[PDB]
Each structure stands twice: as structure tokens, then as C-alpha cells.
């Protein structure tokens, strides 16, 4: 049993079972993955990592579930349920890789387009690896938990299911599944909204303690849901204003997103040569460490500096891109487009995108002809739901003018909105 | 030109010459050195690094020197002066090593007791290395700086020295109290890290630095021009000293935080024969010798912690297992604290000898368990209105708590079983008596 002091939430009280889960290599790993990935290179206040965010989610999940239980004792929320919701909140982000959403949002689709990987699935596998490598099951049993049922409950809270599709808890407790990851209103967003604003200097006027006070479980369409009070909607709209401010000012920051693609580019040029030893001694690459949780345990933002400090000549190309970040010679912005309709470019097809741009035939024939390797195509998703930006690695005014020509034509070819 | 958004100071406008100093590998290296060292392992909000703090000192040094310049043209503060004071503020911490004060405060004294190293000497050497590796001298001249004098002025502002300085004459005495004031203890460096640390630690800081800068003036105090605060800022100054006191007592001197610093140092010492950092000309350096070559030093950051932790080399297993104790939270055990009240203080050159002294103390009641030097950690904790001069608004040209102990000594034990901890306490009590240090409290 411990208290951890956090600048966002103050004193965070942790049950002994939560402390045993936290003080493992699988959890402490999150200290080395920056929350905003490459955003730190734009926002110096944004040095925070997934670890303290995870503590905050575990704390918030516990407060909300405990407050529901005290106000409504008929829900039959047990102290076993509370701990399991806290574990899910603590562990929901175990699966993130180097630079957070850059890794599963961009790097893995570009290195292995045929593989389906999410950080959430990663959190389930890391959670299983954490449980199994630290003898956590006996400590769960020691504190009232029933491992087989509750471990499944925790995983379903993180990833969802595989008519009532959940096995960890029955349908009369369906509201427990809305706490950690939802409506789009869960305690995970509460923590990172507040924490990101604190680190970015952005005012945040959503008050989570007030939403907890007035949370109750009601029935809607013969289903139990967490609902807020009547006139408490204003606090709600303040949360959505903070969501949009954060998305507009930080998450979609043009230079932030460029730098992430540069880091990804360096990881790709390094993926053949970095070795990470996993289970039994087997060796893995950055792109295959997701296949072995012992190797994944050792895959963090440190990969950036392993490349940057390396001397192997084979890592020269990767190294040179990171060096371009330090000297601030970044890829150059070409323009932005959106797919019309409800069409979404799928992660599977990211790698094909630069080729399509280089295959466009700009009407006027430009002096400079560019190759698919000179183009970056950055697909920015939100949950306008998809934006597409193109950057060019060639800096000369000549290549940049040509790069815009390929980009403009490519949008027409796919009938995307025309660049402005 | 460029602008950087910072949560403490808001928009930080950066002159193009500062931008060119910042966008170098020597400066960006500060992104990989945590401000509080091992404190992050006790305070999850304290993920911040020396990079963002150095931007803030650069910013604050500029605001103060510009404010004095605009309100007191008689001081002849040039736009060249402002830039030099900004550069010094930006570059004053370039010399920190992995985990900041742990590195020069503890690791180098224990690894090379014969060397005299400070991060401030490091900052000068790294600043020089930054200048010459990135062609900064021409960019200086392009903006009106005279490199030979101005580089000297910048270095003296960082490291220190009748008038002993050569970068500026004595009539600009006051420029040397902006970035680093050892005499007074009130500089813009502390203003940033007070505000920044409180922000990441959730400690309220009532010191309002902008208001203090607004009312700062240069006045002659005993034949020297010195920066002075308006007399009505005494309440704001109280708030600064209360913040200083809170930070030292709750954070800088935290018991678990300091134990973790010694564990990391212990791991570096166990790894030091086996890590190699490639310096200039391809020559190989170690964690402890990377200070002798700024090319190797550029690549020595907190990364070394994970290099050790993720290693598979059987030669790094001992170092690696210490770092794993941190992750499992099986830390060294606190034994007690003492102070050398009324005695000569312990010096860096003697840190290495302390564990053998403790283990050699002869507790008069013989005990079962015998402990050796290697089971003991001896952690020496140094802390450093005395000379703060005021002025009144009517005569604007004529000048007008609970002191923390100078040196604290804590002892930790690596044996965790409880008979050994009892024995460690007996050795420690006897050692304090042997050295006429204060008797430890229960
Ligand atoms: Zn999260
Ligand atoms: Zn500093």
C-alpha cells in the first residue's frame, strides 16, 4: 500500500495489489515512452511519459467506480470490481511502443503492412506477460480476486470483446465497461486532457471531480449506462472544447507530425540492423519486438538514442535523419487534403501512398522529377475524421514546387478535396 | 527568429543567434538529462529535463537585463550585452551529466577521487565545443558580437572568475549577477527551476518573478553596482525563500529520491569498466572519462541508464541487477542521518573512503553479523536576506527564517535482512561518535 504524489490529481492511494503490479519491469517500462511522442520536439513542456498518465487513469477509474458504488449500493459493486477497474486503468496503456501513437499508428503499418497491431492488443499481451513473470496471480487470490474471471475482465476493459459479448462480468454490470475505455467519455481522456494541458500551458476548464460527483447509473433502452446530471452539460461542453483545442493546437501540430514521420523514417532505415534480444535469447527487430513480450519490454524511446549514438556504418542513413531533427532541417510541408465521402485510407495501404503520389502525372511537365522515396504521406486520424498531409524530403525550391504538382494531381486522381 | 511555447513562461522569443546555438547536438543533448536526476522515480510528475529549464533561464536572463537596460540607460546596456547574458543563461547547464547533480555531485567523486570536475566547468568546455563544431563565431559577428571578448564574457557568467573578470569592465559588475549569483543566492537560474520544479511537483510557488524583475534596479552598494529589489518586494522575497525551503525539504532532499540517486551511481560504477563511448578521433572513453572529451560527453546522457538495464552482456550483470532492484522497488535501506556540526566538513576527495570508515567502526557491543565497506552507502548532501539589498522609491539610488544545515550525511545499507540493518545502525552510530558528528535520532 502506497501513496504517490501527482501534480494533476494530488495524493494517489494505491492498494498493495496495484503496487505489486506497478513495481515490475513491464509497468515501469512506461517511464521511457513519451506521452506525445515527437511533440516534445515542439512543446518543451511535454516531457511527460505514459507511466504517470497510467497512474492517473488507474486513480480516476478507482474514484469513479468507487463513487458509483457509494451513491448506488444496489449496483452491487464489490471491492473486487473496484480493484479490477483500477488495474484496467493502470494497465490500459502497457501496449504502447516508442513515441506512443507513432508506433502503432505509423511505424508498424509502414514496416509490416500485412500485420494488424494495436497498442490495446499490445496492452493485453503485456498485461499477461506482466502477470506471468511476476507471480501476480497468487497476490490477486490473496486479495479476493478470482484470477481467471478477473484477468479476462481486465483485458476486456482494455481491448473490448472477442447480444452480451463479455465474459468477465455479466450484463447487469455492463456499466463497469464504460469506465476505462468508452460515448468517447472515459477516465483515460480525463487524465490525458488534464495532464496534456498542464504540460502544454493550455487552460482546461473541464472539472472531472464534478462529473464524478454527479455520475449515476441509469437504464437507457434496457441497458445500464453511466449518465451525467441535467444541468451539468456545460462542464461537458468544456471537456469537448478542451478536446478540440488539444487536437487543434497539439495533436495535429504541423511540425509535431512532421517530426514523427522523420523518427519513423529513421526507425525504418534502422529496422534491419537494431537487434533486441527476447525470450530464450532469440533476436528481434524494432518491427518484430511486438511478437515477443520479453523483447517488447525493452523497446522504448531509448531506440531513438541507440540510433543517434550508434557508430555502425549500416546505421548511417537512420542516424543522418535523426541528426536532421537536431539541426532542425525538417521535411518540408507540401499540403493537406481529405478524402471525400466517408472513405478512410486504411493502415494496410499506408506504404502504397508515396508511390501513388510519385505516379501522378502533373499536367505541366516540371523540370524536376521526384521519386516515391522523396515523399512522405501522413494520414492523421482523429478517433473532420481523416486528414492527409504530404511532406517532401527534398528541400530545394525546385523539388518543392514539383512536389506540390504531384500532390495536387494525386488528389484529383483519387477525387480528394483539392489542396488550398 | 523563432518562438517557443513553454508552460512556465508562455511565449519565449528567441533571437536567430540563440536559435542557432539551440539547434545543435551539444544543446539538444539536454533533452536527455532529467532535471531532478533520480527524483522522477519518487515524483512521477518530474519528467522534465535540462533542455526546457535552460530555455527558461535564457528567457529570464534576457527579461531582467533588458528591463534594467530600458529603465536605467545610464548603465549603457547594449544589445550585444543582452545577447551575451541570454546566451549564458541558455548555456549555463550544458555541462550536466546523466541525472544532473548526481553525476558531478557523487559519481565522478567516487569514480575519480583525484579529479576536480563541476558541471559548470563542463558547461564552459561544452559551450566552447558547441561554438567550434557548429560555426557559431561568424554568426555572432553577423549580429554584432565580438567573439573574443564576448565568449569570455559568456564563460565567466557561467563558471565565475580587485576586479577579476576580463569579459566586461567593472562598471558592468551587475551583469555577472544575473545568470549565477553565488554571493546573494538570487539569480534567474533559481527562478526558473523554482517555478518549473514546483509545476512538475505540484507545490504552490507564490514567488512572482515578473513583478520582481519589474521592480529591480541597479544601485551602488559599498562601492559596487549591484542589482537591488524595491523595498516593498520583501513579501515576494519571503515567498521565494519559502519556495526554496519547500523544494529542498520535500524534493531535493527526499530520502527515497536520494537513495535512488546512490543506486544509479552504484550501477554506473559497476558498469564503468565495460561501457565505451566513442569520442573524438575514434578513441574510446568510459562513463567516468567522457568528461575529458566533449565529443564523447555529447553522447553521455540518461540513455546510459537504459543501455545498462537492457544489456545482456554478462560483464554488465552486476550493474544491471542494481538497476533492476530500482524497478522491483527493492531499494537500499535507510540507516540514519548525521551532520558535521562544529567540525570540518567532508570533501569530495574523501567520499570514496567513507564506507570503509563506517564498516571499520567498532560498536562496543560485539554483534553477530559483520558488514563490509561494500554493504554501506555514505551519501553526503550539501546545500550550497544575508546580502539582499533594497531601495526605496523616494531615494531610488541608495541601498537599504529557519536555516538549513550546511552538510547532511546519510548512510544506507545494501543488505536488506533485519539483523544486518540493526548491525549497520550500530556501525553508523559508532562512526558518528568517532567523527564527533551529531548523534543520530531514532
Ligand atoms: Zn491512456
Ligand atoms: Zn540551471
CSV table of C-alpha atoms in Angstrom, one decimal, chain B residues 48-433:
chain,number,residue,atom,x,y,z
B,48,UNK,CA,11.3,17.4,-17.1
B,49,UNK,CA,14.8,17.7,-18.5
B,50,UNK,CA,17.6,20.3,-18.6
B,51,UNK,CA,16.6,21.4,-22.1
B,52,UNK,CA,13.4,23.2,-21.2
B,53,UNK,CA,14.9,24.6,-18.0
B,54,UNK,CA,17.8,26.1,-20.0
B,55,UNK,CA,15.4,27.8,-22.4
B,56,UNK,CA,13.7,29.4,-19.4
B,57,UNK,CA,16.9,30.7,-17.9
B,58,UNK,CA,17.9,32.1,-21.3
B,59,UNK,CA,14.5,33.8,-21.4
B,60,UNK,CA,14.6,35.1,-17.8
B,61,UNK,CA,18.2,36.4,-18.2
B,62,UNK,CA,17.0,38.4,-21.2
B,63,UNK,CA,14.0,39.8,-19.5
B,64,UNK,CA,16.0,41.0,-16.5
B,65,UNK,CA,18.9,42.5,-18.4
B,66,UNK,CA,16.6,44.2,-20.9
B,67,UNK,CA,14.4,45.6,-18.1
B,68,UNK,CA,17.4,47.1,-16.3
B,69,UNK,CA,18.6,48.5,-19.7
B,70,UNK,CA,15.3,50.2,-20.6
B,71,UNK,CA,14.8,51.8,-17.2
B,72,UNK,CA,18.4,52.8,-16.5
B,73,UNK,CA,20.1,53.9,-19.7
B,74,UNK,CA,23.0,55.2,-17.5
B,75,UNK,CA,24.2,51.6,-17.3
B,76,UNK,CA,25.0,51.5,-21.0
B,77,UNK,CA,23.5,48.0,-21.6
B,78,UNK,CA,24.0,47.2,-25.2
B,79,UNK,CA,22.0,44.9,-27.5
B,80,UNK,CA,25.3,43.0,-27.5
B,81,UNK,CA,25.2,42.7,-23.7
B,82,UNK,CA,21.6,41.4,-23.8
B,83,UNK,CA,22.5,38.6,-26.2
B,84,UNK,CA,25.6,37.6,-24.2
B,85,UNK,CA,23.5,37.4,-21.0
B,86,UNK,CA,20.8,35.4,-22.9
B,87,UNK,CA,23.5,33.0,-24.3
B,88,UNK,CA,25.0,32.5,-20.8
B,89,UNK,CA,21.5,31.7,-19.4
B,90,UNK,CA,20.8,29.3,-22.2
B,91,UNK,CA,24.2,27.5,-21.9
B,92,UNK,CA,24.9,27.6,-18.1
B,93,UNK,CA,23.7,24.0,-17.8
B,94,UNK,CA,25.4,22.5,-20.9
B,95,UNK,CA,27.9,20.6,-18.7
B,96,UNK,CA,25.5,18.4,-16.7
B,97,UNK,CA,25.9,14.7,-17.0
B,98,UNK,CA,23.5,11.8,-16.6
B,99,UNK,CA,20.9,12.6,-13.9
B,100,UNK,CA,22.3,16.1,-13.4
B,101,UNK,CA,23.7,16.8,-9.9
B,102,UNK,CA,24.1,13.0,-9.2
B,103,UNK,CA,26.8,12.9,-11.8
B,104,UNK,CA,29.2,15.7,-10.7
B,105,UNK,CA,28.0,15.6,-7.1
B,106,UNK,CA,28.5,11.9,-6.5
B,107,UNK,CA,29.6,9.7,-9.4
B,108,UNK,CA,32.7,11.5,-10.5
B,109,UNK,CA,34.0,12.0,-6.9
B,110,UNK,CA,33.5,8.2,-6.3
B,111,UNK,CA,35.0,7.1,-9.7
B,112,UNK,CA,37.9,9.5,-9.9
B,113,UNK,CA,38.5,11.0,-6.4
B,114,UNK,CA,41.6,12.8,-7.7
B,115,UNK,CA,39.8,14.9,-10.4
B,116,UNK,CA,38.2,18.2,-9.8
B,117,UNK,CA,35.1,18.4,-12.0
B,118,UNK,CA,32.0,20.6,-11.8
B,119,UNK,CA,29.1,20.8,-14.3
B,120,UNK,CA,30.0,24.5,-14.6
B,121,UNK,CA,33.4,23.7,-15.9
B,122,UNK,CA,31.6,21.2,-18.1
B,123,UNK,CA,29.3,23.9,-19.3
B,124,UNK,CA,32.3,26.1,-20.4
B,125,UNK,CA,34.0,23.2,-22.2
B,126,UNK,CA,30.8,22.1,-23.9
B,127,UNK,CA,29.9,25.7,-24.8
B,128,UNK,CA,33.4,26.0,-26.5
B,129,UNK,CA,32.8,22.6,-28.2
B,130,UNK,CA,29.4,23.8,-29.4
B,131,UNK,CA,30.8,27.1,-30.8
B,132,UNK,CA,33.6,25.4,-32.8
B,133,UNK,CA,31.6,22.3,-34.0
B,134,UNK,CA,28.8,24.5,-35.5
B,135,UNK,CA,30.5,27.6,-36.9
B,136,UNK,CA,28.9,29.9,-34.3
B,137,UNK,CA,31.6,32.6,-34.3
B,138,UNK,CA,30.7,34.0,-37.7
B,139,UNK,CA,27.0,34.1,-36.8
B,140,UNK,CA,28.0,36.0,-33.6
B,141,UNK,CA,29.9,38.7,-35.7
B,142,UNK,CA,27.0,38.9,-38.1
B,143,UNK,CA,24.9,40.1,-35.1
B,144,UNK,CA,27.4,42.5,-33.6
B,145,UNK,CA,29.1,40.3,-31.0
B,146,UNK,CA,32.8,40.4,-30.7
B,147,UNK,CA,33.6,36.7,-30.2
B,148,UNK,CA,37.0,37.0,-28.3
B,149,UNK,CA,35.6,39.3,-25.6
B,150,UNK,CA,32.0,38.0,-25.7
B,151,UNK,CA,32.8,34.3,-25.5
B,152,UNK,CA,35.0,35.1,-22.5
B,153,UNK,CA,32.1,37.1,-21.0
B,154,UNK,CA,29.7,34.2,-21.6
B,155,UNK,CA,32.0,31.7,-19.9
B,156,UNK,CA,32.7,33.9,-16.9
B,157,UNK,CA,29.0,34.3,-16.4
B,158,UNK,CA,28.8,30.5,-16.2
B,159,UNK,CA,31.9,29.5,-14.2
B,160,UNK,CA,33.0,32.6,-12.4
B,161,UNK,CA,36.4,34.2,-12.5
B,162,UNK,CA,40.4,43.9,-7.3
B,163,UNK,CA,38.3,43.3,-10.5
B,164,UNK,CA,39.0,39.7,-11.7
B,165,UNK,CA,36.8,39.5,-14.8
B,166,UNK,CA,38.0,40.1,-18.4
B,167,UNK,CA,34.8,39.9,-20.4
B,168,UNK,CA,33.4,43.2,-19.2
B,169,UNK,CA,34.8,46.1,-17.2
B,170,UNK,CA,33.9,46.8,-13.6
B,171,UNK,CA,31.2,49.4,-14.5
B,172,UNK,CA,29.1,46.5,-15.7
B,173,UNK,CA,29.6,44.5,-12.5
B,174,UNK,CA,25.9,43.9,-12.3
B,175,UNK,CA,25.7,41.8,-15.4
B,176,UNK,CA,27.5,39.0,-13.6
B,177,UNK,CA,24.8,38.6,-11.0
B,178,UNK,CA,22.1,37.7,-13.5
B,179,UNK,CA,22.7,34.1,-14.5
B,180,UNK,CA,24.6,32.9,-11.5
B,181,UNK,CA,24.9,34.9,-8.2
B,182,UNK,CA,26.9,32.9,-5.6
B,183,UNK,CA,27.2,36.0,-3.4
B,184,UNK,CA,23.5,36.7,-3.0
B,185,UNK,CA,21.9,33.4,-4.0
B,186,UNK,CA,19.2,35.1,-6.1
B,187,UNK,CA,19.6,34.6,-9.9
B,188,UNK,CA,17.4,33.8,-12.8
B,189,UNK,CA,18.6,30.2,-12.9
B,190,UNK,CA,16.9,29.6,-9.5
B,191,UNK,CA,13.8,31.5,-10.6
B,192,UNK,CA,13.3,29.1,-13.5
B,193,UNK,CA,14.0,25.9,-11.6
B,194,UNK,CA,11.9,27.0,-8.6
B,195,UNK,CA,8.9,27.7,-10.8
B,196,UNK,CA,9.5,24.7,-13.0
B,197,UNK,CA,10.1,22.2,-10.2
B,198,UNK,CA,7.0,23.4,-8.3
B,199,UNK,CA,5.0,23.0,-11.5
B,200,UNK,CA,6.1,19.4,-12.0
B,201,UNK,CA,5.9,18.5,-8.3
B,202,UNK,CA,2.5,20.1,-7.5
B,203,UNK,CA,4.0,22.5,-5.0
B,204,UNK,CA,2.5,26.0,-4.9
B,205,UNK,CA,5.0,28.7,-5.7
B,206,UNK,CA,3.9,32.2,-4.7
B,207,UNK,CA,7.1,34.0,-5.8
B,208,UNK,CA,6.1,36.3,-8.7
B,209,UNK,CA,9.3,36.7,-10.7
B,210,UNK,CA,7.9,39.1,-13.4
B,211,UNK,CA,7.0,41.6,-10.7
B,212,UNK,CA,10.4,41.2,-9.1
B,213,UNK,CA,12.1,42.0,-12.5
B,214,UNK,CA,9.7,44.9,-13.0
B,215,UNK,CA,11.0,46.5,-9.7
B,216,UNK,CA,14.6,45.5,-9.9
B,217,UNK,CA,17.2,48.3,-10.1
B,218,UNK,CA,21.0,48.7,-10.2
B,219,UNK,CA,22.3,50.7,-7.2
B,220,UNK,CA,25.7,51.4,-5.8
B,221,UNK,CA,26.2,49.2,-2.7
B,222,UNK,CA,29.6,49.7,-0.9
B,223,UNK,CA,31.4,51.0,-4.0
B,224,UNK,CA,30.0,48.3,-6.3
B,225,UNK,CA,27.0,48.5,-8.7
B,226,UNK,CA,24.6,45.7,-7.7
B,227,UNK,CA,21.1,44.6,-8.6
B,228,UNK,CA,18.6,45.7,-5.9
B,229,UNK,CA,14.9,45.0,-5.1
B,230,UNK,CA,12.3,47.5,-4.3
B,231,UNK,CA,11.7,47.5,-0.5
B,232,UNK,CA,8.0,46.6,-0.9
B,233,UNK,CA,9.0,43.4,-2.7
B,234,UNK,CA,10.0,41.9,0.7
B,235,UNK,CA,6.8,39.9,0.8
B,236,UNK,CA,7.5,38.5,-2.6
B,237,UNK,CA,11.1,37.7,-1.5
B,238,UNK,CA,9.7,35.8,1.6
B,239,UNK,CA,7.6,33.8,-0.9
B,240,UNK,CA,10.8,32.9,-2.9
B,241,UNK,CA,12.6,31.7,0.2
B,242,UNK,CA,9.6,29.7,1.3
B,243,UNK,CA,9.6,28.0,-2.1
B,244,UNK,CA,13.3,27.4,-1.9
B,245,UNK,CA,12.8,25.9,1.5
B,246,UNK,CA,9.9,23.7,0.5
B,247,UNK,CA,11.7,22.4,-2.6
B,248,UNK,CA,14.9,21.4,-0.7
B,249,UNK,CA,12.9,19.8,2.2
B,250,UNK,CA,10.3,18.0,0.1
B,251,UNK,CA,12.1,17.2,-3.1
B,252,UNK,CA,15.8,17.9,-3.4
B,253,UNK,CA,16.5,16.2,0.0
B,254,UNK,CA,13.8,13.5,-0.3
B,255,UNK,CA,15.0,10.3,1.4
B,256,UNK,CA,13.9,7.8,-1.2
B,257,UNK,CA,14.9,10.1,-4.1
B,258,UNK,CA,18.5,10.4,-2.7
B,259,UNK,CA,18.7,6.6,-2.1
B,260,UNK,CA,17.8,6.1,-5.7
B,261,UNK,CA,20.5,8.5,-6.9
B,262,UNK,CA,23.0,6.4,-5.0
B,263,UNK,CA,21.7,3.2,-6.5
B,264,UNK,CA,22.1,4.6,-10.0
B,265,UNK,CA,25.6,5.8,-9.1
B,266,UNK,CA,26.4,2.3,-7.8
B,267,UNK,CA,25.3,0.8,-11.1
B,268,UNK,CA,27.4,3.3,-13.1
B,269,UNK,CA,30.4,2.4,-11.0
B,270,UNK,CA,29.8,-1.4,-11.6
B,271,UNK,CA,29.4,-0.7,-15.4
B,272,UNK,CA,32.2,1.8,-15.8
B,273,UNK,CA,34.8,-0.7,-16.9
B,274,UNK,CA,32.5,-2.0,-19.7
B,275,UNK,CA,30.6,0.8,-21.3
B,276,UNK,CA,32.5,2.5,-24.1
B,277,UNK,CA,31.6,5.9,-25.6
B,278,UNK,CA,33.3,6.9,-28.8
B,279,UNK,CA,34.9,10.3,-28.6
B,280,UNK,CA,37.0,12.4,-31.0
B,281,UNK,CA,39.3,10.6,-33.4
B,282,UNK,CA,37.5,7.3,-32.6
B,283,UNK,CA,39.2,7.0,-29.2
B,284,UNK,CA,37.1,5.1,-26.6
B,285,UNK,CA,36.0,6.6,-23.3
B,286,UNK,CA,34.2,5.4,-20.2
B,287,UNK,CA,31.3,6.9,-18.3
B,288,UNK,CA,33.9,8.3,-15.9
B,289,UNK,CA,36.3,9.6,-18.6
B,290,UNK,CA,33.7,11.0,-21.1
B,291,UNK,CA,34.2,14.3,-19.2
B,292,UNK,CA,37.7,14.6,-20.7
B,293,UNK,CA,36.4,14.7,-24.3
B,294,UNK,CA,33.4,16.8,-25.3
B,295,UNK,CA,32.7,14.6,-28.3
B,296,UNK,CA,32.1,11.6,-26.1
B,297,UNK,CA,30.4,13.8,-23.4
B,298,UNK,CA,27.9,14.9,-26.0
B,299,UNK,CA,26.6,11.3,-26.2
B,300,UNK,CA,26.6,10.6,-22.4
B,301,UNK,CA,23.1,11.2,-21.1
B,302,UNK,CA,20.4,9.4,-19.1
B,303,UNK,CA,20.4,6.9,-22.0
B,304,UNK,CA,23.3,5.2,-20.2
B,305,UNK,CA,20.7,4.0,-17.6
B,306,UNK,CA,18.8,2.1,-20.2
B,307,UNK,CA,21.9,0.9,-22.0
B,308,UNK,CA,22.8,-0.8,-18.7
B,309,UNK,CA,19.3,-2.0,-17.9
B,310,UNK,CA,18.6,-3.6,-21.4
B,311,UNK,CA,22.1,-5.1,-21.7
B,312,UNK,CA,22.6,-8.8,-22.0
B,313,UNK,CA,26.4,-8.7,-21.5
B,314,UNK,CA,27.4,-11.0,-18.6
B,315,UNK,CA,30.0,-8.3,-17.8
B,316,UNK,CA,27.2,-5.8,-17.1
B,317,UNK,CA,25.1,-8.2,-15.0
B,318,UNK,CA,26.2,-6.7,-11.6
B,319,UNK,CA,25.4,-3.1,-12.8
B,320,UNK,CA,22.2,-4.3,-14.5
B,321,UNK,CA,20.9,-6.1,-11.3
B,322,UNK,CA,21.2,-2.9,-9.3
B,323,UNK,CA,19.1,-1.1,-11.8
B,324,UNK,CA,16.6,-4.0,-11.7
B,325,UNK,CA,16.3,-3.5,-7.9
B,326,UNK,CA,15.1,0.0,-8.7
B,327,UNK,CA,12.4,-1.4,-11.0
B,328,UNK,CA,11.3,-4.0,-8.5
B,329,UNK,CA,11.4,-1.3,-5.8
B,330,UNK,CA,13.9,-3.3,-3.7
B,331,UNK,CA,16.0,-0.3,-2.7
B,332,UNK,CA,18.9,0.2,-0.4
B,333,UNK,CA,17.7,0.6,3.2
B,334,UNK,CA,17.9,3.9,5.2
B,335,UNK,CA,20.1,3.6,8.2
B,336,UNK,CA,20.3,7.2,9.6
B,337,UNK,CA,21.4,10.7,9.2
B,338,UNK,CA,24.0,12.9,10.9
B,339,UNK,CA,25.6,16.3,10.4
B,340,UNK,CA,29.2,17.5,11.0
B,341,UNK,CA,28.1,20.3,13.3
B,342,UNK,CA,31.1,22.3,14.5
B,343,UNK,CA,33.5,20.0,12.7
B,344,UNK,CA,35.4,20.3,9.4
B,345,UNK,CA,33.0,19.3,6.5
B,346,UNK,CA,33.5,16.2,4.4
B,347,UNK,CA,35.2,16.9,1.0
B,348,UNK,CA,34.5,15.3,-2.4
B,349,UNK,CA,38.0,13.7,-2.5
B,350,UNK,CA,37.1,11.7,0.6
B,351,UNK,CA,33.7,10.3,-0.4
B,352,UNK,CA,35.2,7.0,-1.6
B,353,UNK,CA,36.8,6.4,1.8
B,354,UNK,CA,33.6,6.9,3.8
B,355,UNK,CA,32.1,3.3,3.5
B,356,UNK,CA,35.3,1.7,4.8
B,357,UNK,CA,35.3,4.1,7.7
B,358,UNK,CA,31.7,3.1,8.7
B,359,UNK,CA,32.5,-0.6,8.3
B,360,UNK,CA,35.6,-0.2,10.4
B,361,UNK,CA,33.8,1.5,13.3
B,362,UNK,CA,33.9,-0.7,16.4
B,363,UNK,CA,30.5,-0.8,18.1
B,364,UNK,CA,31.4,-1.6,21.6
B,365,UNK,CA,28.8,-4.4,21.9
B,366,UNK,CA,30.0,-7.1,19.5
B,367,UNK,CA,27.3,-8.3,17.1
B,368,UNK,CA,26.7,-11.5,15.2
B,369,UNK,CA,26.6,-10.0,11.7
B,370,UNK,CA,29.8,-8.4,10.3
B,371,UNK,CA,29.4,-5.9,7.5
B,372,UNK,CA,32.0,-4.7,5.0
B,373,UNK,CA,32.6,-1.4,3.2
B,374,UNK,CA,30.7,-2.6,0.1
B,375,UNK,CA,27.5,-3.1,2.1
B,376,UNK,CA,27.4,0.6,3.0
B,377,UNK,CA,26.4,3.7,1.1
B,378,UNK,CA,27.5,7.1,2.5
B,379,UNK,CA,25.6,9.9,0.9
B,380,UNK,CA,26.9,13.5,1.5
B,381,UNK,CA,24.2,16.1,0.9
B,382,UNK,CA,25.5,19.7,0.5
B,383,UNK,CA,23.0,22.6,0.2
B,384,UNK,CA,25.3,25.3,-1.3
B,385,UNK,CA,18.5,38.3,3.4
B,386,UNK,CA,22.2,37.9,4.1
B,387,UNK,CA,23.2,40.3,1.3
B,388,UNK,CA,20.0,41.2,-0.5
B,389,UNK,CA,19.9,45.0,-0.8
B,390,UNK,CA,16.8,47.1,-1.2
B,391,UNK,CA,16.0,50.5,-2.4
B,392,UNK,CA,13.2,53.0,-1.7
B,393,UNK,CA,11.1,54.7,-4.3
B,394,UNK,CA,11.8,58.1,-2.9
B,395,UNK,CA,15.6,57.6,-2.9
B,396,UNK,CA,16.0,55.2,-5.8
B,397,UNK,CA,19.8,55.3,-5.8
B,398,UNK,CA,20.8,54.5,-2.3
B,399,UNK,CA,20.6,50.9,-0.8
B,400,UNK,CA,19.0,49.9,2.4
B,401,UNK,CA,13.8,32.1,8.7
B,402,UNK,CA,15.0,28.5,9.5
B,403,UNK,CA,18.4,28.0,8.0
B,404,UNK,CA,19.0,24.5,6.6
B,405,UNK,CA,22.2,22.7,7.7
B,406,UNK,CA,25.3,23.2,5.6
B,407,UNK,CA,26.0,19.5,5.2
B,408,UNK,CA,23.9,16.3,5.9
B,409,UNK,CA,25.3,12.8,5.9
B,410,UNK,CA,23.1,9.8,5.4
B,411,UNK,CA,24.1,6.1,5.4
B,412,UNK,CA,22.2,3.4,3.6
B,413,UNK,CA,22.8,-0.4,3.7
B,414,UNK,CA,22.6,-2.8,0.8
B,415,UNK,CA,21.8,-5.8,3.0
B,416,UNK,CA,18.1,-5.9,3.5
B,417,UNK,CA,17.7,-8.6,6.2
B,418,UNK,CA,16.9,-7.2,9.5
B,419,UNK,CA,19.9,-8.4,11.6
B,420,UNK,CA,22.2,-6.7,9.1
B,421,UNK,CA,20.2,-3.5,9.3
B,422,UNK,CA,20.4,-3.5,13.1
B,423,UNK,CA,24.2,-4.0,12.8
B,424,UNK,CA,24.5,-1.3,10.1
B,425,UNK,CA,22.9,1.1,12.6
B,426,UNK,CA,25.4,0.2,15.3
B,427,UNK,CA,28.3,0.7,12.9
B,428,UNK,CA,26.8,4.1,11.9
B,429,UNK,CA,26.2,5.3,15.5
B,430,UNK,CA,29.8,4.4,16.4
B,431,UNK,CA,31.1,6.1,13.2
B,432,UNK,CA,29.3,9.4,14.1
B,433,UNK,CA,30.7,9.2,17.6
